[PDB]
Design an enzyme around this catalytic site. Structure first.
Site, PDB file in Angstrom:
ATOM      1  N   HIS A 107     -16.825  -4.356   5.355  1.00  0.00           N
ATOM      2  CA  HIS A 107     -15.615  -4.284   4.529  1.00  0.00           C
ATOM      3  C   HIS A 107     -16.095  -4.554   3.095  1.00  0.00           C
ATOM      4  CE1 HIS A 107     -12.837  -5.602   8.116  1.00  0.00           C
ATOM      5  NE2 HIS A 107     -13.306  -4.370   8.246  1.00  0.00           N
ATOM      6  N   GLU A 112      -9.986  -4.986  -3.215  1.00  0.00           N
ATOM      7  CA  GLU A 112      -9.483  -3.802  -2.522  1.00  0.00           C
ATOM      8  C   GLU A 112      -8.494  -3.066  -3.416  1.00  0.00           C
ATOM      9  OE1 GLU A 112      -6.981  -4.029   1.220  1.00  0.00           O
ATOM     10  OE2 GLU A 112      -8.180  -2.280   1.720  1.00  0.00           O
ATOM     11  N   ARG A 121       0.918  -1.137   0.000  1.00  0.00           N
ATOM     12  CA  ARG A 121       0.000   0.000   0.000  1.00  0.00           C
ATOM     13  C   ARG A 121       0.958   1.187   0.000  1.00  0.00           C
ATOM     14  NH1 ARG A 121      -4.856  -1.533   1.795  1.00  0.00           N
ATOM     15  NH2 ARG A 121      -5.104  -3.586   2.769  1.00  0.00           N
ATOM     16  N   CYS A 142     -14.580  -4.713   0.335  1.00  0.00           N
ATOM     17  CA  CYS A 142     -13.713  -5.562  -0.477  1.00  0.00           C
ATOM     18  C   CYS A 142     -14.067  -7.038  -0.365  1.00  0.00           C
ATOM     19  CB  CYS A 142     -12.245  -5.359  -0.109  1.00  0.00           C
ATOM     20  SG  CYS A 142     -11.823  -6.007   1.488  1.00  0.00           S
ATOM     21  N   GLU A 167       1.435  -8.604   4.164  1.00  0.00           N
ATOM     22  CA  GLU A 167       0.094  -9.018   4.529  1.00  0.00           C
ATOM     23  C   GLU A 167      -0.172 -10.410   3.961  1.00  0.00           C
ATOM     24  OE1 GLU A 167      -2.005  -4.504   4.707  1.00  0.00           O
ATOM     25  OE2 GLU A 167      -3.039  -6.138   3.708  1.00  0.00           O
ATOM     26  N   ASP A 221     -16.349  -0.015  -9.948  1.00  0.00           N
ATOM     27  CA  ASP A 221     -17.380   1.005  -9.923  1.00  0.00           C
ATOM     28  C   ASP A 221     -16.771   2.217 -10.617  1.00  0.00           C
ATOM     29  OD1 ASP A 221     -19.382   2.802  -7.414  1.00  0.00           O
ATOM     30  OD2 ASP A 221     -19.765   2.203  -9.501  1.00  0.00           O
TER      31      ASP A 221
END
Lengths: 350, 350, 350
Positions: C322, C54, C10, C324, C43, C111
């Site tokens: 969440h 995500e 990230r 995702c 992660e 989206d």
């Protein structure tokens, strides 16, 4: 590159359309699969698709009109079928074909009704005995009976490989389905063969010419497209007629307003409250009423870009519409109840 | 020769059909592209798709019957996977292959339940780790857990590249996923390789034989018009299992009656009112009770050409049905309330 | 190599994704045609589609963020358009192009809101005057009004083939639509050409560079595979953004739980009673709360595999989620009235 562009004059739509499409197809066959722009000679106003749509409604109306004698309606099944007798109309069939294609490329849905066999044939397939069920129920039952006859054909039912082909005032046309279809009687052994031939006649031989020109048209457009890979004829039907989607949410979105209405109007906010509580049969009636059909395009009802324009102060006049722009002419009534009574009587009376 | 035509006898379906379809490959293999016409030996009746539908039902029933050892049922996903052990069945697979093919050119939907990977392998793709999620839930969890372990694999797990393939009697056969799996322990670095190799075997290698066969068969009745224009495994699943459309209006249309019912009849109207007011959950139990499934064919429910026939006076009998004909035998009950009561209890009891 | 696989940290998604993709592109580019597996550094945790999702949300968010200045937002249409002055971002456009492509094969929807013109351009078709209507509402009106004017353009609107192009702080950029647009006044004879050229520049020449990179990125994942031949661009939009289905029944099936909640639980069963009643306007909101949109992938809401995890005992907090993973963290409230009151405030407050 983009832009098709058809300039036709009402009064001669079909002739003008054809002529232009035959040249375009000659020059760049691809131009037939592009974004259509119709212009009626002497009438201004950019075609935002509404004109092209009227163009379609119009062509479809002339073609299936009994007057021109190209298709026959079956009061029973509610479906048209080529008239084998249509003479010197190669051009019109070529056109109704082109239009069906153009209709698929522009997300426009026509209100056409063919038996599954018309699409099945457009898929390169021959009409068969099973296909007779939708196109000619009557005839199909006979062939079915004959087939399922327990007695001895020949001596019981005296028929040969000859069949009738009447014209408006009777006068059958004893057509031989086979070499000497006079002295070859139908037996519990011929029947199978008899039926398949009677079926190949009617669905195929009977209507070539008319159908040959019809496909040639659909093919000038659909040539080299995912159509060659479609599976069932219903898929072509869906592309031409639309799905039975029923959003209304989404239809409400993308609904514009003209004549001073705006998304916030007791009359508009009430309209929707009403419309949403509508039963589906009613929602489908509203659609028929406001659009040419009760079906939905690719993307759903929201892609219809409906327009609810004001049409006078409170009155008793029923709301009207312009189905080529999907414009609902709505007289601003005094009460939700009046709006509701007046809307229902309008779409159910259509 | 319209139709494909499969003359087969119950009490020898799978074989017979394999033998005909095979021979139909030994000659003008084109026929496979035509409209299927099934004929059970002895039985007289024109196949309007009902006999064909039953052919499909019965076939699909045997092929997935644990007895014939070709597939294994996952009690939990209620899906079936190929059986690495079923050998000498490399023709019976080529058969469902054909059956799945055929079912696509017929709008007869099957009752096949495959984990997405099958369709994925059919489109020409290799099965991978993620695919195990549905095809092998339990296995997938173990592998997911292995990759997600935070401790020190090797210092916590006594596993290597030699995995076992166990009997139906508890006898394990070691299988090496790599060169010399005996030694070569799984570490935090191999685990991925390991998971990828363990997944590749199980989804591709372990069932190459039976799949290839299944692929061939599908390939025999559909060739050239692949799943080109079908980008998602899901698109293929629909073609073979129907959509989750639930039009009902339209299903009410196209519906025919028999045994004195007709479109008008207190009972017949109370039925629709009832059926229409049915919760989607119920609506699906009814399609399943009347047809072989809760799904819909290409074109919406209306294409089911459902039939509702009277079955004697007000009884206590719960209605019944012949799924291969979409016929709903409905006893002319003495009340709308009784219809709903018996019907619901009947659709929930199946 | 089963998957594409993008290990990214990230804080550096755009950049890391770009570098990795530039390597995959150089080495066997094939990987670009495999299903996406995303790994956020540090992660551990198998990407079951959740991570991928995500990753998309973060990428789309960043890329359509006014900050990077690649796209511009239209508050009327709520759509995005390319910024012609987005200078050194050729790699970012490729990235967001590569995302839309993957979207086509992932049953996970992006989206992303583009004017239909974007998807037509992706099919290699140039934009058109009609296309503006959505991308540039006001400019379109002008040109339309220009084309419909019944007066005398010249001594009425005094304008030329030289249009005005601004930059962040005013300062137009007199672009010549034609040779010396300076001195060729727009007349009742030019306007057609003026409007074509104006529509052309804007949708095509104006965004050339940025869109070329965008198309390339899309093209990297969707090679040869038609998408270029689909009848309608909306067909490409659906694949990427999902349709508007609202099964819920089905969304109730396939729905898994975690943290104690089993399919059976008063709180759980109480949940379906509330949602299943609801309004399909609330149902759209709820869907937006738990998952990214109110749209469903190929197959329907059932495919979303929504999870209902128990989030501690009866509290007073609003249930959270969440997106995702389409996970609704549901506190085990003290009744359905709590449940129903809390949820309703949550979805209409988040």
């Amino acid at each position: 590159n983009p832009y098709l562009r058809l300039k036709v004059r009402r009064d001669h739509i079909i002739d003008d359309a054809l002529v232009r499409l035959e040249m375009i197809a000659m020059e760049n066959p691809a131009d037939l699969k592009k974004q259509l722009y119709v212009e009626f000679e002497g009438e201004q106003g950019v075609d935002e698709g509404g004109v092209s749509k009227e163009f379609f409604q119009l062509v479809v109306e002339e073609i299936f009109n009994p007057d021109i004698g190209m298709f026959t309606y079956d009061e029973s099944t509610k479906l048209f079928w080529f008239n084998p007798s249509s003479f010197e109309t190669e051009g019109q069939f070529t056109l109704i074909g082109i239009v069906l294609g153009l209709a698929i490329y522009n997300n426009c849905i026509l209100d056409v009704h063919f038996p599954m066999v018309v699409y099945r044939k457009l898929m390169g397939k021959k009409g068969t005995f099973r296909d007779l069920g939708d196109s000619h129920p009557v005839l199909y039952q006979s062939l079915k009976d004959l087939l399922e006859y327990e007695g001895n054909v020949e001596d019981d039912m005296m028929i040969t490989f000859q069949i009738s082909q009447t014209d408006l005032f009777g006068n059958p046309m004893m057509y031989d389905l086979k070499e000497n279809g006079d002295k070859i009687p139908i037996t519990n052994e011929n029947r199978k063969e008899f039926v398949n031939l009677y079926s190949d006649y009617i669905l195929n031989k009977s209507v070539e010419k008319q159908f040959k020109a019809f496909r040639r048209g659909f093919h000038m457009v659909t040539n080299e497209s995912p159509l060659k890979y479609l599976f069932r004829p219903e898929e072509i039907e869906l592309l031409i007629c639309g799905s039975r989607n029923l959003d209304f949410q989404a239809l409400e979105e993308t609904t514009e307003y003209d004549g001073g209405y705006t998304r916030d109007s007791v009359l508009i906010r009430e309209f929707w409250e009403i419309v949403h509580s509508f039963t589906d049969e009613q929602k489908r009636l509203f659609l028929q009423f406001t659009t040419g059909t009760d079906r939905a395009p690719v993307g759903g009802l929201g892609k219809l870009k409906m327009i609810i324009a004001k049409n006078g102060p409170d009155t008793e006049r029923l709301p009207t519409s312009h189905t080529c722009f999907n414009v609902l002419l709505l007289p601003e009534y005094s009460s939700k109840e009046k709006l509701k009574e007046r809307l229902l009587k309008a779409i159910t009376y259509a």
